[PDB]
Amino acid sequence: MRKQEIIKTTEQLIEAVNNGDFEAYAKICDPGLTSFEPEALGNLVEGMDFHRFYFENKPIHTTILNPHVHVIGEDAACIAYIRLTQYIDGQGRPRTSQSEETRVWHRRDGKWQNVHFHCSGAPVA
Amino acid sequence: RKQEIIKTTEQLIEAVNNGDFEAYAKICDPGLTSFEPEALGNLVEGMDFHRFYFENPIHTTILNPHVHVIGEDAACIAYIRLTQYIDGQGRPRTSQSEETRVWHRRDGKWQNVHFHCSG
Amino acid sequence: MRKQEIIKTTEQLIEAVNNGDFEAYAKICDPGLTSFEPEALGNLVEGMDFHRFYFENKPIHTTILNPHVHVIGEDAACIAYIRLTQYIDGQGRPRTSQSEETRVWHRRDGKWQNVHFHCSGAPVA
Amino acid sequence: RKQEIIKTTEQLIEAVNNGDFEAYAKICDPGLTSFEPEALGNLVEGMDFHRFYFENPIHTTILNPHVHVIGEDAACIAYIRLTQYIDGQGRPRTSQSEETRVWHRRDGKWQNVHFHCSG
Amino acid sequence: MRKQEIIKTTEQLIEAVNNGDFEAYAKICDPGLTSFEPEALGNLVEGMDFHRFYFENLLAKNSKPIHTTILNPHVHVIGEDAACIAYIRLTQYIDGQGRPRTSQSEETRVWHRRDGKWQNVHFHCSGAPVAP
Amino acid sequence: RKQEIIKTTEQLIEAVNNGDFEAYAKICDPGLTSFEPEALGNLVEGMDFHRFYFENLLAKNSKPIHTTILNPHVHVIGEDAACIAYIRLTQYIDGQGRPRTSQSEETRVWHRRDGKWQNVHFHCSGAPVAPL
Amino acid sequence: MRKQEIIKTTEQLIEAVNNGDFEAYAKICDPGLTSFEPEALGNLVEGMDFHRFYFENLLAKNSKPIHTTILNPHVHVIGEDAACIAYIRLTQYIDGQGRPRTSQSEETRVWHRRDGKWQNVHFHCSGAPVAP
Amino acid sequence: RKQEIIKTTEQLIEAVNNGDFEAYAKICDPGLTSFEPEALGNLVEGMDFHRFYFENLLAKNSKPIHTTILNPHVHVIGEDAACIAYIRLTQYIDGQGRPRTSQSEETRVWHRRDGKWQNVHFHCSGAPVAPL
Amino acid sequence: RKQEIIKTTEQLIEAVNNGDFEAYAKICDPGLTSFEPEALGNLVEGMDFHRFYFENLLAKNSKPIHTTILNPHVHVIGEDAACIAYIRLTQYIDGQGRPRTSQSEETRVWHRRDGKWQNVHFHCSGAPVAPL
Amino acid sequence: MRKQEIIKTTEQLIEAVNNGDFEAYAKICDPGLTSFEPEALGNLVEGMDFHRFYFENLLAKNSKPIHTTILNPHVHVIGEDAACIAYIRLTQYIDGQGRPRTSQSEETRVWHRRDGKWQNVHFHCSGAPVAP
Amino acid sequence: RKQEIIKTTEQLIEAVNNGDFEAYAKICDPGLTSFEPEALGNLVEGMDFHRFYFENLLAKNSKPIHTTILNPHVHVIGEDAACIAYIRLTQYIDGQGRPRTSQSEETRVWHRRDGKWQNVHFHCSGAPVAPL
Amino acid sequence: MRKQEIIKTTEQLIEAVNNGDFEAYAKICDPGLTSFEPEALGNLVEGMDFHRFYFENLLAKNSKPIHTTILNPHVHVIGEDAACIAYIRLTQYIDGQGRPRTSQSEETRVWHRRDGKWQNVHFHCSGAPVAP
Amino acid sequence: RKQEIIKTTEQLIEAVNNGDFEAYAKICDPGLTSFEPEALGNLVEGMDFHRFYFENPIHTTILNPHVHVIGEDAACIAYIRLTQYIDGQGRPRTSQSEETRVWHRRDGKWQNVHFHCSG
Amino acid sequence: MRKQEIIKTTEQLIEAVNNGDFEAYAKICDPGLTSFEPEALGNLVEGMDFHRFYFENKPIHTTILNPHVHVIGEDAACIAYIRLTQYIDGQGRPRTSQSEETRVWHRRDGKWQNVHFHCSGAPVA
Amino acid sequence: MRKQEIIKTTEQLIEAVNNGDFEAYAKICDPGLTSFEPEALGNLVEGMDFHRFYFENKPIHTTILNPHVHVIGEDAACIAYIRLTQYIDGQGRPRTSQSEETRVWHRRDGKWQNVHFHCSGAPVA
Amino acid sequence: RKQEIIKTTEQLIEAVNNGDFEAYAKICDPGLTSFEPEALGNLVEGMDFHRFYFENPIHTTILNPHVHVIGEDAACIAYIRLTQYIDGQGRPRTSQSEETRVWHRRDGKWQNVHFHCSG
Incomplete structure (x- = not known):
């Protein structure tokens, strides 16, 4: 119900990193x-x-698998999802990298703000 | 308010080290x-x-805590788990693990809704 | 809604393997x-x-993570789940093994029958 | 009825080998x-x-198919994917992969709802 | 139709090897x-x-619980008294350590029906050698 | 009798070595x-x-090769069926320029259809002996 | 309270090394x-x-885009003109191949305030050596 | 002056070598x-x-050991603050029975509280030199 | 004819496997x-x-073994001379207890003297297949 | 006496291989x-x-100066038109690098005199394969 | 006193780093x-x-180097004799272009003759630290 | 002349280490x-x-028969009460296995005559560490 | 005359295998x-x-002898020494060695003046 | 006395091999x-x-060390000497190779003939 | 002629080492x-x-091969010989060890004294 | 008298390093x-x-000489040969060799009768 907003805001953040637009990330x-x-x-x-x-x-495409949003109060959420990042290596072959992410969210004057971010597995920089 | 979150985290950790599930539950x-x-x-x-x-024989140490308090009944602690133990050979060893625990205060006591562990 | 029955029947089958009761599996x-x-x-x-x-x-405990039941008609279902099997090795240390499973189901005279079963990753025998 | 399931599976495979997504979609x-x-x-x-x-240059071969037909508009094919290709060195290589595709007939044409791949 | 007899006779032979009864194999x-x-x-x-x-x-000390499975058979029937089965031999057994192991072997057996019973004239085997 | 089966096997082998599929087909x-x-x-x-x-x-990878069919054993069944079990000693020259030999154990089941002999099944152990 | 000044002066020193300006470091x-x-x-x-x-x-040919981060500082203030900061140095840089790399180093810097500005009397460094 | 800091450092080191925590504490x-x-x-x-x-x-793992404090450098700040930076040459005997030496670079920041010197921070590079 | 040469070769082989020299001699x-x-x-x-x-x-090293003579080729010369060229597949059980096979290519030149066949020359390639 | 003819005919055959003249070998x-x-x-x-x-x-590009030597011959004469020579083949040649190399091979050749000239019916070779 | 011995040691070291023998001599x-x-x-x-x-x-192998004289210990004997025992931390850049440090433990015995200090004996442990 | 006293005093010190008498060494x-x-x-x-x-x-259990030899001494005499001997230490001993072993070590000892007896102020040692 | 040289060589070899020096001497x-x-x-x-x-347990074999007879009282035998023995593990082993022995007949019996051994 | 002739004839043979003159060797x-x-x-x-x-x-020089000539009768000798052959390898560095030689000699119509020749160690071809 | 005395005195010294009698060696x-x-x-x-x-x-036997005595004056000699030492290892197998020795001799009041001794190859202690 | 033996040894060594045989001879x-x-x-x-x-480019150094003088016209020097050279890579290398040279004074000049070299 309310968890659908948390998944959409997480995609925006991820897209900001993949596109390389910091002002959106910030x-x-x-x-x-x-x-x-x-x-x-x-x-x-x-x-x-x-x-x-x-x-x-480099051409990349992130996929957000098995999301699990824990909603707390009116302005707090905790999404725990898997980051399947598809990219192409320098050699030219396509590669996939898995990373387990936890993002704690806090709604401030309308938009959702990211206060904490955990990442296990492969780095996606 | 962050001092309460660190104390409740220790209780949980101690429940795992002592092996008392009823306390963990x-x-x-x-x-x-x-x-x-x-x-x-x-x-x-x-x-x-x-x-x-x-x-x-083990001893867990909670280093560099960072509690993000949200509202009245929500918190997010991000700490490091330095677990000291003794190997089969008899020599002492340390193992580092990065933990994130999301907390929710329900009818008084703090409840753990999510738990991340790296390392 | 109807997918909840498919997950329950899958657990019964898994439990039959862990308990070692073939008549239930059969x-x-x-x-x-x-x-x-x-x-x-x-x-x-x-x-x-x-x-x-x-x-x-040997003391083991199976966990069924991220189920995805595709219901077809009145008497057909396709569950695609992950099998996290926790056990204790001969040395005495605890071990976890991941395996990706797909089970195609067919409801025959009441009870659900398993017609096909796919398993990737670690074997759980 | 199983002969239709094997033909539709080939079309899908050919769409991947040819690289035509609209056919795959x-x-x-x-x-x-x-x-x-x-x-x-x-x-x-x-x-x-x-x-x-x-x-x-590749050529896929579909060996030992086994179609489980359920109702009027449901099927489960379990086949082996022997994909023949040529490595960078120039020598020919084969790669085996075990596939399970669950099918659902919707407004005429067969739709692929689930797809498993081992190897 | 007639291929079902070839698969049954192949099982008898395999069972003779697993049971270790030569007179049946012979x-x-x-x-x-x-x-x-x-x-x-x-x-x-x-x-x-x-x-x-x-x-x-x-x-008898080395006698291990084993179970052979005959997967993807393909019987080529020739005339009234000749057949060629090409099957895969998935042999399940338990090693000396006590852990269960599976071994694959690709087999071709050419058959010839003589005075009733089917006789095995040729036998090909690729992969793992799966005689106890 | 069996001499016809060995000659037809050579034709097939020569079709693979020469790389003429229409003859193989x-x-x-x-x-x-x-x-x-x-x-x-x-x-x-x-x-x-x-x-x-x-x-x-x-054509750049086309190497001088010569196949030899050693210890043939043709099992003739009826009028239009045969099973040859032979060894394939394939002699070739590697990229370095040195001569090499490769052994492969083959079983080919034959069926005479409208004159010419047709190959219904083919088993091969050891080295893969096709120019590629 | 007073520890915030020690962290700022430590950054200036670190920035002097990353920028390669010795007069500021000195x-x-x-x-x-x-x-x-x-x-x-x-x-x-x-x-x-x-x-x-x-x-x-x-x-200048070996000059690489780098960015130092000072994590988990712990300033021990002694008297009016003495401090001991114990921090972690996460230095982010780009290797010759062009890929980005991070290097951790555990640092202890003992500070002494002389005629206004803070002077560095001792400096400990464990882990990776992170001078360009 | 600095001579007091070196003596108090030895007491601490001796507490670790002897395994007396109450003295260390x-x-x-x-x-x-x-x-x-x-x-x-x-x-x-x-x-x-x-x-x-x-x-x-x-007590079974208790080995004859002797620590040596080489090239000390005490930075005295105010009346009740000091920073010693010394090398820890720990001599011991391994399980095999052969004698071994291990080097470790140490920095200890000291604070004089109600008479006795208290250790507020402690840095250690090289070998971990604690009996265990 | 050639059938006598193969029988006499088996007797010799059996003399080696049994370890009876008087029969070999x-x-x-x-x-x-x-x-x-x-x-x-x-x-x-x-x-x-x-x-x-x-x-x-x-007798302590005496292992259950069984020799098989595959693809014989006897070249008969005159009344009292023969040349058999066969393969020696020797099946045995190693010290560990596992069964092993060893191939050896043999040529034996025979000469019939006062009734019985005498072995004048003996060639052996591959594995040495004598119980020792 | 008669063995001298067998050694001469063996040299002719060997020389046919070294010279690369098949018609003489045939x-x-x-x-x-x-x-x-x-x-x-x-x-x-x-x-x-x-x-x-x-x-x-x-x-012709790979054609190397070589010289075969036939050491310790042992000719077993049977009847009027049969012989068995067992000799060692020391083949001297020059490698691609330009250094001289020797290769030993143990050979057994069974001979049969047909319409004058000696015919080679069987040929055994152990050690190094010494055909160019 | 001892300060003169350390200065004369630097001159000698600089003569080796600069490659000026007349100064060294x-x-x-x-x-x-x-x-x-x-x-x-x-x-x-x-x-x-x-x-x-x-x-x-x-001159092609001439690399930017800088020697540092750490923890000196000058033992002065009489009016015209000294014994310095120091560590030689030589910083240089390898052929690959990366910066490297090399430690060497040195003892130099000095004798003041007609004004200037003369080096009579020189001990060196660890790395050889001469540009070559 | 005066160098003979320096070599004798060096032997006394060495003998104190080999005998394990510290009071003499001290x-x-x-x-x-x-x-x-x-x-x-x-x-x-x-x-x-x-x-x-x-x-x-x-x-005493590890006490091994050893004998030190002082080869190619070179004593640099300075003033009345100062000397610098630079000698090689060939230490002969017997290992735990029972075989005899020799170990070379290059030593420099700076001497200072105080109230009669010669005192050792500095001691350098390269090569093998030759204390029991 | 060469047959006498081979017999005397065997006696010498047997003296070494038996370990009787007086015969060797x-x-x-x-x-x-x-x-x-x-x-x-x-x-x-x-x-x-x-x-x-x-x-x-050993057994020496003298293969491919070649005796060069010179005058009445001089000979040069060049033979191969195939020595069969059993290793510590218990398996049988062969060792080849190329030998040249120069002989001189003195007051009846043959005396060995020089002895070469390769391998 | 008579052994000096055997050493001289051995040198001639060796020189024939080093010079590569077969007619002299023959x-x-x-x-x-x-x-x-x-x-x-x-x-x-x-x-x-x-x-x-x-x-x-290639520039080579053979040295005949520790000769031991056993003279038998009027027309028979057995020299046992060491062959130190000095040469220069393809790389250009100088190398020495030791080989133990036994040559049995027989005087036929004046000149000494070599009937047998043993060589241990390195080959000098 | 006079070289025969140098070889005999060298054997006495060698025998003193093999027998382990220092007073004779001294x-x-x-x-x-x-x-x-x-x-x-x-x-x-x-x-x-x-x-x-x-x-x-341990049972050992030294052999002195290819001696070469350089006699100088009345009371000086330089022998250059090879030391083939035959012994039995701890395992029980027999071993031979070669060592090249040079001993410079000086005749003092009758008996020959050894002033210098060189040894290459294997040590015989 | 030993100082003459060391000087003559240097001349010989220099003859080898310079490659002048007539001086060596x-x-x-x-x-x-x-x-x-x-x-x-x-x-x-x-x-x-x-x-x-x-x-x-080489430079030989004669370390720790020990001349044993015998009679009027005989000497035995035992010295170490530290030969400094530059390898193909271009780095400088040292090689140690232990030498013994026995000398005999004949019609004025010193003649070298024997020469030992280890290392």
Whole structure:
């Protein structure tokens, strides 16, 4: 019912990363963002500044499989989905990479803000 | 308010290390989701999966906690799990694991709705 | 709605294998059963007789994750689920094994019969 | 009735080998599920996943088919996919894959609702 | 139609090997039997005697629960008293460690009906050698 | 008698070595079954599988080769049926320029249809001995 | 409260190394600087001169887009003009092949406030050596 | 001056070598941070982490060891603050019975509280040199 | 004719498998030449060379074995001379307890002297197939 | 006495192979020739055709100065028109690199005198295959 | 005092890094002894040994290098004698273009003769740190 | 002339280590002793205490017959009360297996005559570490 | 005359296999030279070297002898030594060695003046 | 005394091989020559014909060390010497090769003939 | 002529080492003895003291092959011989070891004294 | 007297490094014996063996000499040969060799009668 909005906002964020448009990513993310990801080497990154590097510095298509949104109150949600990223390597052969993601959401003045983001498996930068 | 979230997380961790499921079951939401290395990159649907490990010398340390409080009855702690143990050879070993636990306060006590584990 | 019956009948079959009760397995399966599984070495096995071997010849717990039942007509269904089998090895350490399963179902005189069964990943015999 | 299921399966396979998506899209059910080696042990939710491979010398052979017909408008074919191709070195190679396709006849033509692929 | 008899006679022969009863094997096989098999090291063995070794030297201590499955048969019937079955041999057994194992072998058996019963004149075997 | 079966087998083999499919297609039964190392332990149905190896054969990779048929054993059944079980010693020259030999154990089941002998089944152990 | 100044001064120093501006590094560091780092091979280097090498010998051809992140800081304030920050150095860069790489290094910097600005008296570094 | 800091460091080291935690606990600040090889590139918070190594030390594994503190460099700040940066040459005897030496680069930040010196932070590169 | 040569060859082979030299000595010509893998590419003169393998055979190492003579080709010359060229498929059981097959290509030149057939020369390629 | 003729005829055959003149080889060999040789992969090749390959596919670019030596001959004469020579083949040649190499091979040739000239009915070869 | 010994040691080191022998020859005693890794565990007598490394240094192999003298310990004896025991951290850039550090433990015995300090003995453990 | 006293005092020290008598070693060595040796892992150890470990932890069960030889000495005499000997240490011993072994080590010892007896202020050692 | 040289060579060989030096000493010339693998490519000066091996199940076979007779009291035999023995594992092994023995008939019996051994 | 003639005739033969003059080698050798050498692969070669190959198909210098001539009768000798052959490899570096030789000699109508020749170690062809 | 005395005195010394009688070795050797040997690790040992170790701390037989004595003056000689030492290893198998030796001799008050001793190849301690 | 022996040894060494045989031939005794690594553990009989190396950037250093003087016209020097050279790669290398040279003064100049070389 309300979980359908959380999945749509998650796609927008993912599309911002695949397209490489930071201004869209920055809007959907909470300036005070925490994140565990394989690129962080088992550390909790504090800023946008960490992610900006990957934006500022190939045909791909992300698929969001088996979503599970835990809705809390009026303005809080926790989606736990799988990230099947399809891309083409330098050699020219097509490759798929699986990554398990958890994104904690907080609705602030209308739009949904991303406060925390967990990522297991392959890095998608 | 974040200090309460860290205390409830320790209780849950202690329940796993002590092997007391009834304590784990209380602190966890019966409708629990979880990504963990044991799940082989799948989202387990709750309790019954964990029960297996309970029914069938260590010291856990919770480093660099970061609690994101949302509303009155919602929190998201993102901490590191440094588990110290002793191998079969007899030498002491440490294992690092990155954990995210999403919390929901229901009729007083804090319930764990989702749990992520890397490493 | 009707998919909930297919998931329950699948659990009964799985439980029959874990418990090692063939008579229950034989009832839920169609005597004319086809099956691709890792034990078959990429061949389509024809009988119960193949499975009987594993029954006639350890604490485990199977979990059925991300089910997807395709209902066709009144008496036909196709469930596509993941088999997370938790067990304890000979050394005494606990192990988990993932296997992707597809079971095609056919309702005959009340009870659901299993006509075909696909299994990718780890064998659970 | 099983002879129709084998013919429709060939059309789909030929659509993939020829790289004509419009033919693949017609024969497949928009709400398509699929276990395949490319999915990394996950159940893909349909079309968009496959489109990638289409948009971005071989001969396929369909060995030992086994069609389970259910009702008037339902079938389950379980066949082997012997795909013959030529490697970069120039030598010819064969690759075996075990496939299960669940079919549903909708307004005349057969639609593919589920597709399993091992090997 | 007539191919169903060829598959039944093939099972009897296979069961004779799994059970280790040579007299049954000897009856179903043609005394002038040719055979390519992995045990022969790429040679065509003559009639019987070669196989007897595997039957006779089978000890009860090494006797393991096994079950053979005959998958995707293809019987080519020629005349009234001749047939050629080409099947796959999925042999399920339990190793010395106690774990269950499966072994695939591709078999071709040429049959000749003599005074009622079917006689095996030639036998080809690729893959794993699946005599106990 | 058996001498006709060995001659027809050579024609088929020569069709593969020369890379002339039309000759291969004539001598083979359109409904052909076959176990061979290229099939990965499966029973192929059709010419279509074999056509690939004929058509994709380049003249640049065309090497001087000579097949030898050793220790034949033809089992004649009725008037229009035969089963030859022979060894295929294929002599060729590798890309480096050195001469190499490859052994393969073959069983071909034959059926005489409207004059000429047709190949209904074909088994092959050892090395895959097709120019490709 | 006062720890926020220590984290800001640490960033300035780090930025001086990433930008390759020694004059800024020299100002923020105490001329009598001690340092354990992976480049020192388990020795305590004396004040400056050792570091100058890495600044001066940095060529523009090898100049790579890099971005340092300071994670989980822990500032121990002592008196009015002394601090000890213990932080993790996640350095993001792009290798010669063109692929992006991250390198972790555990750092401890002991600070001493002299005539206004903070001076770095000691510097410890575990893990990867992350000077260009 | 600096001579007091080196003496207090020896007491702490001796507490670890002797395996007496109560002495270690006294000399260390309950709010202790620490980078060490056992922490896997993380900053540990507490005694609790260290207690494990003291308590789980068996008398059967108790080996004759002798620590040497080489090239100390004490940075004194104010009246009640110091930063020693020394090398830890730990001499021990392995299970085989042969004598072995292990080098580790250490930085310990000290704070004098109600008389005795308290250890607030502790850095360790190289070998983990705790009896276990 | 050639059937007598194959029977006498079996007697000789059986004498080696049974380890009865007196039978071997009778069937062999005292002036026997032989190329075999045990000779290291030399032509041995005498029984004396072979006697070693018979006499030094222990009962503890005595294994169930069965030799098979495949694709014989006897070249008869005059009344009292023959040349058999056969393959020796020796089936045995290794120390581990598993069954093994070993191929060896043999040529034996025969000479009929005062009734019984005498072996004047013996060639052996492949595996040395004597119980030892 | 009569053995000297057998050694001379063997040299002629060997020289025919080294010179690459098949017509001379074909004359000295019996059209119904059997042969065990390393090139045959432990099989008994039929008469001619197999050998022709090595003669015909010999290129002038790969033509190397070679010299065969026949050491320790042992001719077993049977009747008037039958002989069995067992000799060693030391073939001296020069490799592609330009260095001289020697290769040993143990040979047995069974001879039959037909209308004057000696015909070779069987030929065994162990060790190195020494056809250009 | 000891500060003069460290300055004269730098001059000598700089003479080796710059490749100016005349400066090295002046600062060294013509009757110089030396243990170094290049000597293969022997005590070299003369400049002549060292001259080789100076003279055979090519400008093509000339790399940007910087030596650092860490933890000096000068033992002054009388008016005209000193013994410095220091560590040689030599920073350089390899042929691949990556920066490398090499540690070497050095002992230099000094003797003040007609004003300037002369080097009578020189010990070197670890890496040989001469541009060559 | 005066160098003969330096070689005798060096032997006394060496004999103190081989005999395992520390009190004799302690007398001949300067309490403020520096030393580079292979056991120190490229560090300069402080005075005594480091060495005591090797003396005290020497067990009688591991006590092996050893004999040190001082080859090619070179004593540099400075003033009245200073000397620098540079010698090779050929230590002969017997391993646990019982076989005799020799170990080479290049040593430099700087000497200072204090109230009669010669005191050792510095000691360098390359090659094998030759303390029991 | 060559048949006598082969018989005397067997006696010498048998003396070594049996380990009877007095027989070896008689058949050998006190001034004996010898190249053998034990000598490490040096020419041993006689008896005393061999005595060591005597003082501190096999069957030797002498294949392809070639005796060069010179004058009345001189011969040069060049033969192959196929020595059959049993290894520690219990399996039978053969070892080839190429030998040249130069003979000199002195007061009746044949004396061995030189002995070469390859392999 | 008489052994000095045997060493001189051995040098002539060796020089014939190093110079590659067969006619000189053929004269000094007995047409019925036996020989064990490393090139023969542990066989006794019968002819000149074997050696001719090496003649018909680089700066070297042979040295004859520790000769030991056993003189028998008037026309028989047995020299046992070491062959230190110095040569330069294809790379251009100088190499030495040791070979232990025994040559049995027979004086026929004046000149010494070589009836047998043994060679251990390295081949000098 | 005079070289025969040098070979006899060399045997006495060798026998003293094989028998393990130092007093005999000490007499035949010059107290001021130099020596290059494999045990010295490419150094020139100065004393008896080095050798004493091996004496103070198995059936063997030494053979002295191809001696070459260079006689200088009335009381000086230089023998250059090969040391073929035959022994039995711990396993029980017989082994031979070659070593090239040079011993410089000086006749002092009757008996020959050994002033220098070189040894290449295998050590015989 | 030992200082003359060391000077004559340098002249000989320099003759080898410079490749001037006439100088080497003068300083060496025509009846020269020599153990060296090139001889493969054999005693070479003089000149002709060495000539090969002469007819078909380095710096030699003579360390720790020890001259044993015997009579008026005899000496035995035992020294170490540290030869410095540059490999094909271009890096500098050192090679150690232990040498013993026995000297005999004949009509003025010192002649080399024997020469040992290890390493």
